[PDB]
Short mmCIF file of C-alpha atoms and ligand atoms in Angstrom, two decimals:
data_model
loop_
_atom_site.label_atom_id
_atom_site.label_comp_id
_atom_site.label_asym_id
_atom_site.label_seq_id
_atom_site.Cartn_x
_atom_site.Cartn_y
_atom_site.Cartn_z
CA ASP A 1 1.81 -7.50 28.86
CA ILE A 2 4.31 -7.69 26.00
CA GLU A 3 1.04 -7.92 24.13
CA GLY A 4 0.88 -4.14 24.35
CA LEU A 5 4.38 -4.07 22.88
CA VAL A 6 3.68 -6.36 19.91
CA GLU A 7 0.58 -4.39 18.93
CA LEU A 8 2.53 -1.17 19.05
CA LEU A 9 5.31 -2.77 17.01
CA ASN A 10 3.15 -4.24 14.25
CA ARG A 11 0.58 -1.56 13.77
CA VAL A 12 3.04 1.25 14.13
CA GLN A 13 6.42 0.25 12.73
CA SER A 14 4.65 -0.40 9.38
CA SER A 15 2.63 2.81 9.35
CA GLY A 16 6.06 3.96 8.21
CA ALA A 17 5.34 2.07 4.99
CA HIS A 18 3.60 5.39 4.54
CA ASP A 19 5.70 8.44 5.40
CA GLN A 20 3.33 8.91 2.48
CA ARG A 21 0.29 10.03 4.46
CA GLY A 22 -1.59 13.27 5.17
CA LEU A 23 -1.02 16.58 3.38
CA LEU A 24 2.39 17.55 2.01
CA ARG A 25 4.88 18.69 4.69
CA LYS A 26 8.41 20.17 4.49
CA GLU A 27 9.87 16.93 5.91
CA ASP A 28 8.74 14.81 2.95
CA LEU A 29 10.34 17.30 0.55
CA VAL A 30 14.00 17.15 1.57
CA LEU A 31 15.73 16.51 -1.78
CA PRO A 32 17.32 13.01 -1.96
CA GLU A 33 21.07 12.70 -1.39
CA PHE A 34 21.81 11.39 -4.89
CA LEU A 35 20.73 14.99 -5.45
CA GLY B 1 -33.52 -4.85 22.42
CA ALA B 2 -30.69 -2.90 20.78
CA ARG B 3 -27.20 -4.28 21.36
CA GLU B 4 -24.01 -2.29 21.26
CA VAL B 5 -21.59 -4.15 19.03
CA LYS B 6 -18.06 -3.01 19.76
CA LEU B 7 -15.83 -3.91 16.83
CA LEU B 8 -12.09 -3.54 17.20
CA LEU B 9 -9.80 -3.46 14.13
CA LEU B 10 -6.28 -4.83 14.63
CA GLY B 11 -3.40 -5.53 12.28
CA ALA B 12 -0.11 -4.11 11.00
CA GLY B 13 -0.03 -0.72 9.33
CA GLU B 14 -0.96 -0.94 5.64
CA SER B 15 -3.14 -4.00 6.34
CA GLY B 16 -6.28 -2.10 5.40
CA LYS B 17 -7.83 -1.17 8.78
CA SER B 18 -8.42 2.46 7.93
CA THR B 19 -9.88 1.46 4.57
CA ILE B 20 -12.48 -0.90 6.08
CA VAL B 21 -13.66 2.01 8.25
CA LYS B 22 -14.29 4.19 5.22
CA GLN B 23 -16.10 1.34 3.51
CA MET B 24 -18.55 1.32 6.43
CA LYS B 25 -19.43 4.99 5.89
CA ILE B 26 -19.97 4.39 2.17
CA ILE B 27 -22.07 1.30 2.78
CA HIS B 28 -23.82 1.66 6.13
CA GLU B 29 -23.77 5.45 6.29
CA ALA B 30 -24.18 8.46 4.01
CA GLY B 31 -20.86 8.07 2.25
CA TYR B 32 -19.13 11.08 0.70
CA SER B 33 -21.11 13.87 -0.97
CA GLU B 34 -19.71 15.98 -3.80
CA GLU B 35 -19.16 18.96 -1.48
CA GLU B 36 -17.13 16.48 0.55
CA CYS B 37 -15.22 14.76 -2.26
CA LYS B 38 -14.02 18.11 -3.56
CA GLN B 39 -12.61 18.39 -0.06
CA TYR B 40 -10.12 15.61 -0.77
CA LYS B 41 -8.36 17.08 -3.82
CA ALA B 42 -5.64 18.40 -1.54
CA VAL B 43 -4.92 14.92 -0.12
CA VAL B 44 -5.32 13.14 -3.44
CA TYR B 45 -2.53 15.35 -4.82
CA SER B 46 -0.50 15.23 -1.64
CA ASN B 47 -0.60 11.43 -1.86
CA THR B 48 0.17 11.34 -5.58
CA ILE B 49 3.29 13.42 -5.01
CA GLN B 50 4.41 11.46 -1.94
CA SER B 51 4.17 8.31 -4.05
CA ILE B 52 6.36 9.41 -6.97
CA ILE B 53 8.77 10.76 -4.36
CA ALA B 54 8.84 7.50 -2.41
CA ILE B 55 9.90 5.84 -5.66
CA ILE B 56 12.43 8.55 -6.55
CA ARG B 57 13.97 8.16 -3.08
CA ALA B 58 14.05 4.38 -3.58
CA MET B 59 16.00 4.75 -6.86
CA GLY B 60 18.74 6.52 -4.92
CA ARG B 61 19.20 3.94 -2.16
CA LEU B 62 18.95 1.03 -4.62
CA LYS B 63 21.12 2.84 -7.20
CA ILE B 64 18.62 2.48 -10.08
CA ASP B 65 19.26 4.98 -12.89
CA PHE B 66 16.64 6.76 -15.00
CA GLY B 67 15.98 5.23 -18.39
CA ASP B 68 16.59 8.80 -19.60
CA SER B 69 19.05 11.08 -17.83
CA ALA B 70 16.84 14.12 -18.43
CA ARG B 71 14.51 12.94 -15.67
CA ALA B 72 17.15 14.04 -13.12
CA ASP B 73 16.10 17.62 -13.87
CA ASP B 74 12.45 16.63 -13.48
CA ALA B 75 13.14 14.87 -10.18
CA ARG B 76 15.03 17.86 -8.80
CA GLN B 77 12.20 19.99 -10.14
CA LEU B 78 9.63 17.69 -8.55
CA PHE B 79 10.75 18.71 -5.07
CA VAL B 80 10.74 22.43 -5.81
CA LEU B 81 7.39 22.55 -7.58
CA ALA B 82 5.86 20.31 -4.90
CA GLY B 83 7.09 22.45 -2.06
CA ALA B 84 5.53 25.49 -3.73
CA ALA B 85 2.15 24.42 -5.11
CA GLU B 86 -0.83 25.60 -3.04
CA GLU B 87 -2.57 22.54 -1.65
CA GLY B 88 -5.65 21.51 -3.59
CA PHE B 89 -4.35 22.48 -7.02
CA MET B 90 -1.85 20.92 -9.44
CA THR B 91 -0.32 22.91 -12.29
CA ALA B 92 0.18 21.75 -15.87
CA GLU B 93 3.86 21.98 -14.97
CA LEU B 94 3.86 19.55 -12.04
CA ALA B 95 1.55 17.18 -13.88
CA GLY B 96 4.08 17.05 -16.68
CA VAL B 97 7.07 16.36 -14.47
CA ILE B 98 5.18 13.55 -12.75
CA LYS B 99 3.94 12.10 -16.03
CA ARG B 100 7.46 12.05 -17.44
CA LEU B 101 8.96 10.51 -14.28
CA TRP B 102 6.23 7.86 -13.97
CA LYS B 103 6.79 7.11 -17.66
CA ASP B 104 10.60 6.65 -17.29
CA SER B 105 11.78 3.04 -17.63
CA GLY B 106 14.26 3.64 -14.82
CA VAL B 107 11.48 4.74 -12.49
CA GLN B 108 9.19 1.92 -13.63
CA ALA B 109 12.09 -0.46 -13.03
CA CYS B 110 12.32 0.78 -9.47
CA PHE B 111 8.53 0.63 -9.11
CA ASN B 112 8.68 -3.05 -9.94
CA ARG B 113 11.07 -3.61 -7.08
CA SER B 114 8.77 -1.99 -4.51
CA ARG B 115 9.28 -5.12 -2.39
CA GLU B 116 12.75 -3.82 -1.49
CA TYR B 117 11.31 -0.69 0.05
CA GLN B 118 8.00 0.56 1.43
CA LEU B 119 5.67 1.92 -1.24
CA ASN B 120 2.09 2.56 -0.20
CA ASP B 121 -0.50 0.67 -2.25
CA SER B 122 -2.16 3.77 -3.66
CA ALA B 123 0.81 5.03 -5.68
CA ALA B 124 -0.12 2.92 -8.71
CA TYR B 125 -3.82 3.81 -8.41
CA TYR B 126 -3.09 7.53 -8.59
CA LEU B 127 -0.02 7.68 -10.85
CA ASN B 128 -1.89 5.93 -13.64
CA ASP B 129 -4.92 8.26 -13.41
CA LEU B 130 -2.75 11.37 -13.81
CA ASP B 131 -4.72 12.32 -16.94
CA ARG B 132 -7.93 12.66 -14.94
CA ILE B 133 -6.43 13.67 -11.58
CA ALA B 134 -4.28 16.43 -13.10
CA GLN B 135 -7.09 18.21 -14.98
CA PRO B 136 -8.16 21.36 -13.04
CA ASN B 137 -11.90 20.57 -13.36
CA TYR B 138 -11.11 17.44 -11.35
CA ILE B 139 -13.54 16.16 -8.77
CA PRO B 140 -12.37 13.21 -6.68
CA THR B 141 -14.77 10.28 -7.05
CA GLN B 142 -15.79 8.00 -4.20
CA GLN B 143 -13.20 5.40 -5.13
CA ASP B 144 -10.66 8.26 -5.31
CA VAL B 145 -11.50 9.30 -1.74
CA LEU B 146 -11.45 5.66 -0.62
CA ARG B 147 -7.82 5.42 -1.75
CA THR B 148 -6.67 8.55 0.09
CA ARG B 149 -4.38 8.43 3.15
CA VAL B 150 -4.90 10.81 6.09
CA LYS B 151 -4.09 11.39 9.79
CA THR B 152 -4.56 8.83 12.58
CA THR B 153 -4.53 11.30 15.45
CA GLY B 154 -5.58 9.17 18.39
CA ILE B 155 -8.19 6.51 17.65
CA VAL B 156 -10.44 6.41 14.58
CA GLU B 157 -14.09 5.31 14.78
CA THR B 158 -17.50 5.11 13.10
CA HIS B 159 -21.03 4.62 14.36
CA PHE B 160 -23.51 2.83 12.16
CA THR B 161 -26.67 0.78 12.43
CA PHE B 162 -26.83 -2.52 10.60
CA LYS B 163 -29.37 -5.29 11.16
CA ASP B 164 -30.66 -3.20 14.07
CA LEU B 165 -27.32 -3.28 15.86
CA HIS B 166 -25.37 -0.31 17.20
CA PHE B 167 -22.00 -0.86 15.56
CA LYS B 168 -19.08 1.02 17.03
CA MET B 169 -15.95 0.32 14.96
CA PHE B 170 -12.60 1.18 16.57
CA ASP B 171 -9.18 1.49 14.98
CA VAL B 172 -5.91 2.64 16.50
CA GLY B 173 -2.75 2.37 14.41
CA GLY B 174 0.52 4.15 14.95
CA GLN B 175 -0.88 6.25 17.76
CA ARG B 176 1.15 4.69 20.57
CA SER B 177 -1.58 3.64 22.97
CA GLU B 178 -0.58 2.49 26.43
CA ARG B 179 -1.79 -0.48 28.48
CA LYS B 180 -4.34 2.08 29.60
CA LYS B 181 -5.97 2.70 26.21
CA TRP B 182 -5.36 -0.87 25.07
CA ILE B 183 -7.03 -2.50 28.05
CA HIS B 184 -9.81 0.06 27.57
CA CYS B 185 -10.14 -0.82 23.89
CA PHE B 186 -10.32 -4.56 24.53
CA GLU B 187 -12.83 -4.20 27.37
CA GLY B 188 -16.27 -4.51 25.80
CA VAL B 189 -15.13 -6.03 22.50
CA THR B 190 -17.75 -8.11 20.73
CA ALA B 191 -15.50 -8.99 17.80
CA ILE B 192 -11.92 -8.38 16.72
CA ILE B 193 -11.42 -7.98 12.98
CA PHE B 194 -7.75 -8.83 12.35
CA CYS B 195 -6.45 -7.48 9.02
CA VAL B 196 -3.52 -9.01 7.13
CA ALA B 197 -1.92 -7.74 3.93
CA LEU B 198 -1.41 -10.94 1.94
CA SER B 199 0.64 -8.99 -0.57
CA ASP B 200 3.21 -8.34 2.17
CA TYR B 201 4.50 -11.91 1.78
CA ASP B 202 7.33 -10.78 -0.50
CA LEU B 203 8.57 -7.78 1.51
CA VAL B 204 12.32 -7.76 2.10
CA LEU B 205 12.92 -7.58 5.85
CA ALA B 206 14.13 -4.38 7.45
CA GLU B 207 17.51 -3.94 9.11
CA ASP B 208 15.70 -4.21 12.45
CA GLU B 209 13.35 -7.18 12.00
CA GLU B 210 14.17 -10.74 13.08
CA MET B 211 11.21 -12.18 11.19
CA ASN B 212 9.26 -10.94 8.17
CA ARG B 213 6.07 -8.86 8.05
CA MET B 214 3.84 -11.89 7.62
CA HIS B 215 5.29 -13.79 10.59
CA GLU B 216 5.21 -10.65 12.72
CA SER B 217 1.51 -10.42 11.86
CA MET B 218 1.18 -14.16 12.50
CA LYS B 219 2.75 -13.70 15.94
CA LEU B 220 0.32 -10.95 16.93
CA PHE B 221 -2.62 -12.98 15.64
CA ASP B 222 -1.50 -15.94 17.69
CA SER B 223 -1.75 -13.92 20.90
CA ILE B 224 -5.04 -12.19 20.14
CA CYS B 225 -6.46 -15.53 19.09
CA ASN B 226 -5.44 -17.73 22.01
CA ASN B 227 -6.06 -15.09 24.68
CA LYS B 228 -8.72 -16.35 27.11
CA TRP B 229 -9.94 -12.81 27.59
CA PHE B 230 -11.20 -12.83 23.98
CA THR B 231 -12.86 -16.24 24.30
CA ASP B 232 -16.47 -15.12 23.76
CA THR B 233 -15.13 -12.48 21.38
CA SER B 234 -15.81 -13.21 17.69
CA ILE B 235 -12.45 -13.42 15.92
CA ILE B 236 -12.85 -12.43 12.27
CA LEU B 237 -9.74 -12.77 10.11
CA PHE B 238 -9.51 -10.60 7.00
CA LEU B 239 -6.84 -11.90 4.65
CA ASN B 240 -6.84 -8.63 2.71
CA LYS B 241 -5.18 -7.34 -0.48
CA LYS B 242 -5.96 -10.50 -2.40
CA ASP B 243 -5.91 -8.53 -5.66
CA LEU B 244 -2.30 -7.45 -5.17
CA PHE B 245 -1.50 -10.95 -3.91
CA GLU B 246 -2.86 -12.56 -7.06
CA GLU B 247 -0.89 -10.09 -9.17
CA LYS B 248 2.29 -10.78 -7.19
CA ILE B 249 2.21 -14.54 -6.65
CA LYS B 250 2.75 -14.68 -10.39
CA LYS B 251 6.34 -13.35 -10.25
CA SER B 252 7.41 -13.79 -6.59
CA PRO B 253 7.18 -17.25 -4.97
CA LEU B 254 5.64 -17.75 -1.53
CA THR B 255 8.86 -19.53 -0.54
CA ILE B 256 10.19 -16.00 0.00
CA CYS B 257 7.94 -15.79 3.04
CA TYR B 258 7.58 -19.48 3.97
CA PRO B 259 10.73 -21.31 2.80
CA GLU B 260 9.20 -24.68 3.64
CA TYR B 261 6.28 -24.17 1.25
CA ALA B 262 6.20 -26.86 -1.45
CA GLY B 263 2.90 -26.18 -3.20
CA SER B 264 2.36 -24.67 -6.62
CA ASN B 265 2.52 -20.95 -7.23
CA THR B 266 -1.17 -20.44 -7.89
CA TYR B 267 -3.18 -17.77 -6.12
CA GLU B 268 -5.27 -20.74 -4.88
CA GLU B 269 -2.65 -22.94 -3.22
CA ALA B 270 -0.55 -20.06 -1.90
CA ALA B 271 -3.65 -18.40 -0.44
CA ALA B 272 -4.85 -21.68 1.04
CA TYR B 273 -1.42 -22.14 2.59
CA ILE B 274 -1.46 -18.72 4.29
CA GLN B 275 -5.01 -19.33 5.55
CA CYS B 276 -3.63 -22.44 7.27
CA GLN B 277 -0.56 -20.77 8.73
CA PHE B 278 -2.81 -18.30 10.55
CA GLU B 279 -5.61 -20.70 11.52
CA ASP B 280 -3.22 -23.37 12.81
CA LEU B 281 -2.04 -20.81 15.34
CA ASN B 282 -5.34 -21.51 17.13
CA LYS B 283 -4.69 -23.64 20.23
CA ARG B 284 -8.33 -24.56 20.76
CA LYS B 285 -9.75 -25.51 17.38
CA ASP B 286 -12.55 -27.10 19.45
CA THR B 287 -13.08 -24.24 21.88
CA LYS B 288 -12.83 -21.32 19.38
CA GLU B 289 -13.54 -20.74 15.70
CA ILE B 290 -11.78 -18.34 13.32
CA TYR B 291 -13.95 -16.50 10.80
CA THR B 292 -11.66 -16.00 7.78
CA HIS B 293 -12.54 -13.99 4.67
CA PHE B 294 -10.25 -13.19 1.75
CA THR B 295 -11.03 -9.58 0.88
CA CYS B 296 -10.15 -6.42 -1.00
CA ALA B 297 -10.66 -3.53 1.45
CA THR B 298 -10.86 -1.06 -1.42
CA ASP B 299 -13.66 -2.98 -3.14
CA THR B 300 -16.94 -1.62 -1.78
CA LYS B 301 -18.91 -4.51 -3.26
CA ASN B 302 -16.72 -7.25 -1.78
CA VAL B 303 -16.50 -5.48 1.60
CA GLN B 304 -20.25 -4.99 1.80
CA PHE B 305 -20.64 -8.69 1.04
CA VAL B 306 -17.97 -9.81 3.52
CA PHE B 307 -19.21 -7.52 6.28
CA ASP B 308 -22.67 -8.86 5.64
CA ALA B 309 -21.43 -12.31 6.65
CA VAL B 310 -19.42 -11.07 9.64
CA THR B 311 -22.64 -9.65 11.05
CA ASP B 312 -24.42 -13.00 10.77
CA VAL B 313 -21.64 -14.50 12.85
CA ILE B 314 -22.02 -11.67 15.36
CA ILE B 315 -25.81 -11.76 15.28
CA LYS B 316 -25.76 -15.40 16.33
CA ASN B 317 -22.47 -15.98 18.14
CA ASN B 318 -24.39 -13.99 20.74
CA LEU B 319 -26.11 -17.35 21.20
CA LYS B 320 -29.37 -16.13 19.69
N1 LIG C 1 -4.95 -2.46 -4.01
C1 LIG C 1 -5.37 -2.53 -2.76
N2 LIG C 1 -5.01 -1.57 -1.87
C2 LIG C 1 -5.53 -1.80 -0.63
C3 LIG C 1 -6.33 -2.84 -0.18
N3 LIG C 1 -6.62 -2.68 1.16
C4 LIG C 1 -6.01 -1.58 1.51
N4 LIG C 1 -5.32 -1.00 0.47
C5 LIG C 1 -4.47 0.22 0.39
O1 LIG C 1 -3.31 -0.06 1.19
C6 LIG C 1 -3.11 0.91 2.28
C7 LIG C 1 -3.57 0.43 3.71
O2 LIG C 1 -4.31 1.53 4.18
P1 LIG C 1 -5.41 1.78 5.31
O3 LIG C 1 -5.34 3.15 4.69
O4 LIG C 1 -6.26 0.67 4.93
O5 LIG C 1 -4.20 1.86 6.43
P2 LIG C 1 -3.88 0.61 7.54
O6 LIG C 1 -5.08 0.52 8.34
O7 LIG C 1 -2.67 1.16 8.24
O8 LIG C 1 -3.31 -0.70 7.04
C8 LIG C 1 -3.91 2.11 1.66
O9 LIG C 1 -3.02 2.70 0.68
C9 LIG C 1 -5.10 1.44 0.96
O10 LIG C 1 -5.67 2.25 -0.04
C10 LIG C 1 -6.69 -3.85 -1.13
O11 LIG C 1 -7.38 -4.85 -0.93
N5 LIG C 1 -6.15 -3.61 -2.42
CS1 LIG C 2 -27.81 2.45 8.15
CS1 LIG C 3 -22.78 9.52 -1.38
CS1 LIG C 4 20.50 6.36 -18.87
CS1 LIG C 5 4.76 -2.63 -7.57
CS1 LIG C 6 -6.22 4.99 -16.09
CS1 LIG C 7 -16.01 9.83 13.62
CS1 LIG C 8 -22.38 8.01 12.01
MG1 LIG C 9 -1.65 3.02 9.79
#
């Protein structure tokens, strides 16, 4: 049901609250625009 | 006879699901040995860096300037040094840059506005312990490992015996699981432990969200709760992060999250209010019961205690 949606939207969309997870990777190193 | 107790962890990312799992290994399992803690240095540092960076990035978007303009060199240097330091070790150079940035009033100013962005709740824990963490003879402690943040490739789980029960704790989270996996995760559930990050009550909503984090969590709970399929399923509610909540409620009113709220701004009344918002979602207060516990996922003592009670509910909700 949409139930599957909601669970994927709440438990995922916030895992972003942590692009801060796992070991250090090139992606998380891109120097910020205000350089 | 031995019963399989299938425990399913649900709740928004950052709610503390992954942390409860680790608490089980520390409590009802072996825990982490020294040979194994040393193994986390790489992540402990990886996380520490990601945290100061999350904040540095935030200063840009929010236009918050460094208390001291020199830090701009440090920041720029933070990204070079980081993307150049062999995992597992941290040089006296990187430790310095981080210490100076974390010390900057501009950066602390931004840190205090973490509600406007998404800062993991381990940044503070690690950035303060830089003295210890930075030293090369550093050995992550259990609490250090408990605060780490790793990979959720697929579905995480733990097996452990408690009160002669075969506990199987499941936790998805981010890993897009389809109706397939989901249905398969629900099937066999003995109890659903729904985690909620109380401290999320003050989070500014994203450009995409119609409602705030709390209400999005409330919505999901509503469904899980009033879903006939989970009738005989024990519904434990973990209103987690009460430590951060207590610290926050001081400065940020609950009216941010529940505009109608008219109570006082005490940890007590605010917390009681949230416990009601979730429990009132229950459509059969007669049919089903909600087992709520205010917890601190990262507190081994409190978790042990709280999980001790959950088991009693499981041990007997099985009408026996
Ligand atoms: N201070 C504090 N941090 C917590 C608590 N519960 C979880 N956390 C932290 O908040 C984040 C949630 O992480 P977990 O790793 O539990 O991931 P989740 O399952 O996606 O929500 C991690 O940074 C935890 O260390 C708590 O009660 N207090
Ligand atoms: Cs055990
Ligand atoms: Cs141990
Ligand atoms: Cs300045
Ligand atoms: Cs903060
Ligand atoms: Cs400290
Ligand atoms: Cs495992
Ligand atoms: Cs085990
Ligand atoms: Mg997660």
